[PDB]
Amino acid sequence: SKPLMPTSTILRLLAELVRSYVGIATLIANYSYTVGQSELIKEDCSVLAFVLDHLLPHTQNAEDKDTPALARLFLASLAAAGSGTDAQVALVNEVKAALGRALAMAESTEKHARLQAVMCIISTIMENNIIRLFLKKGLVNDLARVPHSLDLSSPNMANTVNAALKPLETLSRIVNQ
């Protein structure tokens, strides 16, 4: 009775069609949902925004177990696929938007799961045009401002800060080496 293509499988499929076909990454990047298109959708938002906010973050109650590994694969593929700048710029812009959104979010384990998962996707992407874009957009400076937008007493705060330090170390090294 369970659906045969869970969102995990659909993500792996899209990751494959991105890695093969040039236009798919740009079409997925520009495609955006509409208000009241699904129960989980509150307002017009990009697919990348939804993948960053609702599918990528670890959450304690399962719907599919391995949705996050495959949204990470999907966004990794959408980066690695060169697709000129049409796909990579919208990916980076949407990651920046979801970071600022989650930092403005109210203090919650939802906030820390979103933050940790965005740091993890920046780290996987980071593992050269993506780095050029991360510099141009000031993503490193928005990562460094992360603790300004934390409650420094939270029991999660150290884990989300570790996560945000992980791309900062790699990026500062790759720049100044």
């Binding site: 009775s1 369970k2 659906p3 045969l4 293509m5 499988t9 659909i10 792996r12 499929l13 494959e16 069609l17 093969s20 076909y21 040039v22 236009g23 798919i24």
Partner: protein
């Protein structure tokens, strides 16, 4: 014992616990579950005693008891949890159900207070300081998650009700109010001394528990050492807590050492230790508390156990003080315990320095203390050859372990001669002489100290003999009863290996008949608990095996003992015979443990005989007549019925096998055969039937056993059942010795079995086999509930004596098992004997075994039988028996056995049993028998076994190719060809007699499948055997199709064997016969399809229900059962006959009818989805697979045609690829011509030899594999009935039908077939667009896991890629692939070196890698490769 007396006494309770398991621990867990939810002191006493019990269900209560206002109980709970974590990992392994609530409560106790740096040092927390020299935040609560309270004194009452009032005034986080309670009770405590010390102590306990299982910091060691320095002397319990914490922290060690000062003689810890010791020694100076001293000597133990600490204890010279302890301390139990602690420390310290110990004469001090303690036992137990207090026994044990270690240590090798001229032997003499006052492990340590000394200085064994220590050891280990334990038994032979070492010692050892005494251990129930396997995971008899290997080492050092050892072994065997022979004993699972004796003795003898593999013990034993007493053990009357399957019988068989394989001696088999012939001659009344209406002889011997409650336990009550179970044990020994691969042992086995006695036994075993099949089938006929018999008193007359049904069954079941298990062992024996016979006397062995096969197949019951089923069940097991004996695993025959099975008989009887089984004894002819209504119940099961045998008998590809062929040469020479002539001729008539009749209720599809396999083998074989009756197979292949299609209507699963039969009839006959077959199959499909096309016209007039009837009529009409096999047959035929069957499927137009049927069924299936009662027509998958392979075949014919258009039909040059040079080197002309000819024939693979190397080509992969090396190398062919395929109007209808079948989730296997078809069709983007324009990706996403299959996600991904790949995107992706393959030297499964630059880069190879892309689209691949290469 006194524990049980204490339990009964307790069961004023608290007064008794103040004076000082399951139901006492349960009453404790009771009051724990009661008090935590004249009480508190009861809880405290229960705890204070339990903290002794664990040191030699409560958890969930104890964890709640930490929420106490009076810290005394918190402390006691911690002391108990410390005793736990110290001794065993009981709380570490526990689950997080309560481990985390516990460990968190402990963390909240343990967590720091700010230490010295904030004025909360433990030293300052323990000195009073006036309560005004502490930080003002001490009497203050500051709990955050917000609560702050300046001081707790104005509300000092009721801290628990304070916490509950805070529960009501504030919402305290759930499940973490413990950190509040501990802060509040602390802030109440700190005001006063006792409560502050109790908080300190609780914190120290909590640390220690948290370390035996963020808390630790730089100042903690210094704080603890300053607690130890505090000299008010009222703190000794806090000092002991601090030391126990330091102990936990050892498990920072350099800091512990730097603070305590152990690196120097002057230093706080060493000085404290020396003052404790001096206070313990001298009575005037008061003694430091026992608890504190124990914490000190435990800390020294754990510190010494680590190298940094042992080196520090060297440096401060603690050995001098500890030897002072071990020299001057008194006799009382606590002082003894401090002595054993000091001894274990002197052990750890001497594992890295000896010089201090030696310079302090420590060995003399140890020996004097051993003298003093032995002198204090001498008063209690003065006996010496001319209970010990536990603490003294532990002292002695640690001190003898030290002496053994020192003897095995240099720095005593000079001087250890002067140990045994001390008092030591006079005190060992007392331990050895009193192994019952002193423990057995202490008696062991004493004999091992002597053994290790004698191995260090064998010279001074003369001194030990002069003072008679060896003569006391002998008396204590032989003449006095050996203490019954594994370690003592394991050591006796090493001890005797020492005592023999002086030759005088050997004389003394052999003087006292040592092995008569030593081996009695194996026949004594007192030592069976010592012999029982430890951990239940070491082998059975592991300890007797060790003992035997040690006695082997002993008497290989001292060969003079070998003869007496083997004499005492043979006396063991003769006594086991005695205990098994006379009636007065009865084997327990008077009861006697005989089977344990037999296992232990046999593991002992096995170890001895097989240890060195020098065949000196085997020879001696056989020459001392031990094989008679050995082999008799199998036949012992009073051994139980379940003996033969037991590990003791397998042990006896293993000893026989060891003797056979070491000595190469026939005598084991000769003697086994003599005794087996003796037993078989006893039970000839089993061969003679009742000779009246009667049942089993075993059940007439049972029933006539008077009324004894259990006859089967008596050898006189059931003589035949016990001779059965003796023969079974002998047969399992012959099995074990036949399961041998040494050709020499095989040869001497066969030479023995071929003897006059061997063949007398083998004849009697054959008659026994047929008697046991009779008896077992009669007995099962009597345990059946009055169904199988024909209402007759066949064995009832004896069941009426035996006895309301179970009361009779449960007396027969021991007979049934004793007779059925023996039959299976006989069959195993004869199979092994056939293997040995095949690989002159073998020929007589095989003769007697084929006379058994004839006897079994021609056996007829007595004429009093109530039903033929007893004969059919005899025949079924005779056939299932003859199969293993004529044919190996992998189904190759033994030609010696087929020769004798033919010449002697059994082939005419094998086929006569078929005629008999069908005719029912001639009552009905065979041609009417099968279809007769009154055919016996088991005639389908017999025919299943008979047909499965004949399938093996007929196959030429094994009967001619068998590895087990006879050599080429007085004897009649065998021909497997004439054997197949007569067998196929005899089989064909019987199959005729079953060809068309309706199948049996059960065992009819296995009958049909083996009958069809026989026909296939005959039809393939006659072409090959006429090379070295044809019109009968001709007319058969003409008329067979009515029967084939009858079989497809009755038993669809036979269709694969019907395909193979039709293919062999085709390869016999011409294309004129292929056409007739294919047109007839196609006409059956045609009419079955057209009736379903008329079955689904929309039901306008409503005559039928038009909903449930119509939906299920399409799926259930007989025609819809036919199609599922007529199409499937046609598809298998198509797969083999690729192009003729394609051209017929084209020219008949049947494909249009099947497309029309797939279209017309869609309204029905859709309506079924709307009934929510989908039930998929099974015929859909054959049709989709047929269409799939029809268009696969047409693809391929066009590609092969235009390939032929580019090839010369003469000498097509095949070339093999040399990756190293990059050359397509040609084959020789004969290899090239062979490969081309065999590719053109369509063979999948071709074998050839070049340079005597064996090469094979695989045209599936186009690879040459070298058969010797397995190297795979690429090959190429050097280039220089037209199947129209599916038309657009068919493809359009198929795509719509596949989308509708995806809409309604028809079935998993049907979705797989329809998606496979879509995958083939959509490879043209026009049809992929059609498939995507009909909204099929929504259906695919909606599909539930009930409608899924292994390939679903790959296949769906490929389909979606087919939708995505329009001409331009496919071109650009092909460009990416071509560039990637040309730039990167890709590896392959053709040994093309990875990232090679010759082989990986040839155009002719790269085109082979890119072949999948060329198939994806060849035109586009040309355009791309022309533009990018």
């Amino acid at each position: 014992a006194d524990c049980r007396a204490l339990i009964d006494k307790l069961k004023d309770e608290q007064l008794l616990l103040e004076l000082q398991w399951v139901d006492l621990l349960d009453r404790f867990d009771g009051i724990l579950a009661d008090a935590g939810q004249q009480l508190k002191m009861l809880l405290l006493a229960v705890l204070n005693f339990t903290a002794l019990l664990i040191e030699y269900s409560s958890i969930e209560h104890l964890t709640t008891l930490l929420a106490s206002s009076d810290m005394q109980v918190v402390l006691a709970v911690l002391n108990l949890l410390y005793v736990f974590s110290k001794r065993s990992n009981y709380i570490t392994r526990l689950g997080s159900d309560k481990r985390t609530p516990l460990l968190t409560r402990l963390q909240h106790l343990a967590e720091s207070w700010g230490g010295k740096e904030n004025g909360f040092g433990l030293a300052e927390c323990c000195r009073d300081l006036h309560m005004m020299k502490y930080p003002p935040s001490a009497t203050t609560l500051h709990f955050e998650f917000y609560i702050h309270i300046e001081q707790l004194d104005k509300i000092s009452e009721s801290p628990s009700e304070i916490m509950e009032s805070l529960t009501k005034m504030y919402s305290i986080p759930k499940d973490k109010q413990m950190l509040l309670f501990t802060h509040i009770r602390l802030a109440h405590g700190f005001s006063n001394h006792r409560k502050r010390l109790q908080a300190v102590q609780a914190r120290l306990h909590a640390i220690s528990i948290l370390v035996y299982s963020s808390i630790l910091y730089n100042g903690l060691i210094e704080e603890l050492v300053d607690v130890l320095q505090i000299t008010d002397k009222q703190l000794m319990e806090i000092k002991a807590a601090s030391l126990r914490t330091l102990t936990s922290i050892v498990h920072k060690l350099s800091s512990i050492i730097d603070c305590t000062g152990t690196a120097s003689y002057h230093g706080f810890l060493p000085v404290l230790v020396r003052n404790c010791i001096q206070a313990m020694i001298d009575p005037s100076m008061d003694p430091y508390p026992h608890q504190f001293a124990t914490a000190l000597f435990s800390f020294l133990y754990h510190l010494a156990s680590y190298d940094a600490g042992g080196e520090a204890l060297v440096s401060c010279g603690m050995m001098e003080a500890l030897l002072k302890v071990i020299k001057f301390l008194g006799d009382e139990q606590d002082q003894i315990t401090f002595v054993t602690r000091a001894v274990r420390v002197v052990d750890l310290i001497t594992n890295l320095d000896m010089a201090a110990f030696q310079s302090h004469s420590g060995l003399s001090i140890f020996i004097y203390r051993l003298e003093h303690e032995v002198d204090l036992c001498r008063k209690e137990c003065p006996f010496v050859i001319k209970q010990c207090i536990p603490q003294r026994a532990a002292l002695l044990k640690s001190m003898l372990n030290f002496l053994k270690k020192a003897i095995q240590d240099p720095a005593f090798s000079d001087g250890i001669r002067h140990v045994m001229d001390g008092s030591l032997p006079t005190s060992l003499k007392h331990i050895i002489s009193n192994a019952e006052y002193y423990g057995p492990s202490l008696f062991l340590l004493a004999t091992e100290v002597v053994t290790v000394f004698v191995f260090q200085e064998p010279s001074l064994l003369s001194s030990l003999q002069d003072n008679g220590l060896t003569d006391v050891m002998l008396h204590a280990l032989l003449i006095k009863d050996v203490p019954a334990t594994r370690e003592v038994l394991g050591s006796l032979p090493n001890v005797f290996s020492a005592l023999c070492l002086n030759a005088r010692g050997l004389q003394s050892f052999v003087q006292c008949q040592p092995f008569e005494r030593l081996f009695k251990v194996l026949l004594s129930p007192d030592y069976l608990p010592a012999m029982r396997r430890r951990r239940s995971s070491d082998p059975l008899g592991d300890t007797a095996s060790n003992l035997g290997s040690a006695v082997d080492e002993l008497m290989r050092h001292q060969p003079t003992l070998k003869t007496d050892a083997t004499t005492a072994i043979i006396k063991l065997l003769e006594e086991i015979c005695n205990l098994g022979r006379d009636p007065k004993y009865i084997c327990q699972k008077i009861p006697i443990p005989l089977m344990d004796y037999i296992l232990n003795v046999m593991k002992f003898v096995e170890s001895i005989l097989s240890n060195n593999t020098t065949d000196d013990h085997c020879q001696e034993f056989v020459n001392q007549k031990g094989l008679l007493p050995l082999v008799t053990i199998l036949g012992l009357p009073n051994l139980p019925i379940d003996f033969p399957t037991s590990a003791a019988c397998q042990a006896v068989a293993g000893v026989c096998k060891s003797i056979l394989t070491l000595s190469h001696e026939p005598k084991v088999l000769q003697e086994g055969l003599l005794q087996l012939d003796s037993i078989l001659s006893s039970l000839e009344p089993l061969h003679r039937p009742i000779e009246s209406p009667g049942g089993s002889v075993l059940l007439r011997e049972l029933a006539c056993a008077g009324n004894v409650a259990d006859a089967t336990l008596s050898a006189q009550a059931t003589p035949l059942l016990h001779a059965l179970t003796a023969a079974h044990a002998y047969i399992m020994m012959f099995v074990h010795t036949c399961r041998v691969g040494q050709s020499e042992i095989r040869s001497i086995s066969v030479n023995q079995w071929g003897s006059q006695l061997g063949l007398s036994v083998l004849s009697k075993l054959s008659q026994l086999y047929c008697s046991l099949v009779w008896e077992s089938t009669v007995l099962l006929s009597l345990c059946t509930p009055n169904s199988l018999p024909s209402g007759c008193e066949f064995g009832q007359a004896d069941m009426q004596k035996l006895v309301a049904m179970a009361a009779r069954i449960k007396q027969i079941k021991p007979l049934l098992s004793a007779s059925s298990r023996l039959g299976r062992a006989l069959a195993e024996l004869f199979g092994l004997l056939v293997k040995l016979c095949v690989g002159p006397a073998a020929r007589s062995t095989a003769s007697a075994l084929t006379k058994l096969l004839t006897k079994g197949l021609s056996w007829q019951p007595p004429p009093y039988t109530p039903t033929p089923r007893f004969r059919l069940t005899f025949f079924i097991c005779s056939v299932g028996f003859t199969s293993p004996m004529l044919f190996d695993e992998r189904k190759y025959p033994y030609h010696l056995m087929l020769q004798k099975f033919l010449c002697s008989g059994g082939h005419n009887a094998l086929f006569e049993t078929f005629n008999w089984a069908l005719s029912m004894g001639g009552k009905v002819p065979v041609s009417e028998g099968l279809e007769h209504s009154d055919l016996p119940d088991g005639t389908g099961e017999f025919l299943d076994a008979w047909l499965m045998l004949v399938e093996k008998m007929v196959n030429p590809t094994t009967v001619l190719e068998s590895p087990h062929s006879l050599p080429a040469k007085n004897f009649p020479q065998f021909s497997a060809l004439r054997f197949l002539v007569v067998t196929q001729k005899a089989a064909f008539t019987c199959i005729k007699n079953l060809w068309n009749r309706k199948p049996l209720k059960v065992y009819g599809g296995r009958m049909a499948e083996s009958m069809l396999a026989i026909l296939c083998h005959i039809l393939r074989g006659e072409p090959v055997i006429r090379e070295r009756e044809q019109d009968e197979l001709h007319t058969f292949t003409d008329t067979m199709l009515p029967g084939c299609f009858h079989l497809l209507d009755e038993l669809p699963d036979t269709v694969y064997r019907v395909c193979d039969l039709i293919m062999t009839a085709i390869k016999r006959n011409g294309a004129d016969y292929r056409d007739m077959i294919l047109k007839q199959v196609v006409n059956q499909v045609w009419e079955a399809a057209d009736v379903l096309i008329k079955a689904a016209l929309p039901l306008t007039t409503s005559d039928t229900k038009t909903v449930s009837e119509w939906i299920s009529q399409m799926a259930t009409l007989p025609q819809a059962s036919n199609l599922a096999t007529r199409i499937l047959l046609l598809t298998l035929l198509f797969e083999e006959l690729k192009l003729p069957c394609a051209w017929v499927v084209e020219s008949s137009g049947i494909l249009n009818v099947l497309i029309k049927l797939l279209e017309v069924v869609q309204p029905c299936l859709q309506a079924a989805k709307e009934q929510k009662e989908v039930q998929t027509p099974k015929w859909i998958t054959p049709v989709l697979l047929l269409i799939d392979f029809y268009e696969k075949t047409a693809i391929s014919s066009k590609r092969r045609a235009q390939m032929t258009k580019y090839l010369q039909s003469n000498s097509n040059n095949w070339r093999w690829f040399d990756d190293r040079s990059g050359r397509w080197c040609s084959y020789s002309a004969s290899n090239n011509s062979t490969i081309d000819s065999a590719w053109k024939s369509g063979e999948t693979s071709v074998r050839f030899t070049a340079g005597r190397r064996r090469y094979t080509v695989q045209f599936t992969t186009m690879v040459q594999v070298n058969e010797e090396t397995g190297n795979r190398r690429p090959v190429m062919l050097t280039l220089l009935i037209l199947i129209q395929g599916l038309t657009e109007d068919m493809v359009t209808v198929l795509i719509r039908a596949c989308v509708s079948m995806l809409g309604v989730p028809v079935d998993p296997d049907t979705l797989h077939a329809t998606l496979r078809l879509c995958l083939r069709l959509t490879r043209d983007h026009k049809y992929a667009m059609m498939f995507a324009e009909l909204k099929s990706t929504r259906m695919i996403l909606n599909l539930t896991q009930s409608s899924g299959f292994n390939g679903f996600t790959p296949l769906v991904t490929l389909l979606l890629r087919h939708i995505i790949e329009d001409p331009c995107t496919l071109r650009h992706t092909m460009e990416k692939v071509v560039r990637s393959a040309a730039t990167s030297g890709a590896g392959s499964t053709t040994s093309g070196v990875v990232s090679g630059s010759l082989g990986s880069r040839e155009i002719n190879y790269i085109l082979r890698v890119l072949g999948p892309a060329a198939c994806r689209n060849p035109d586009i691949f040309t355009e791309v490769a022309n533009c990018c290469i």
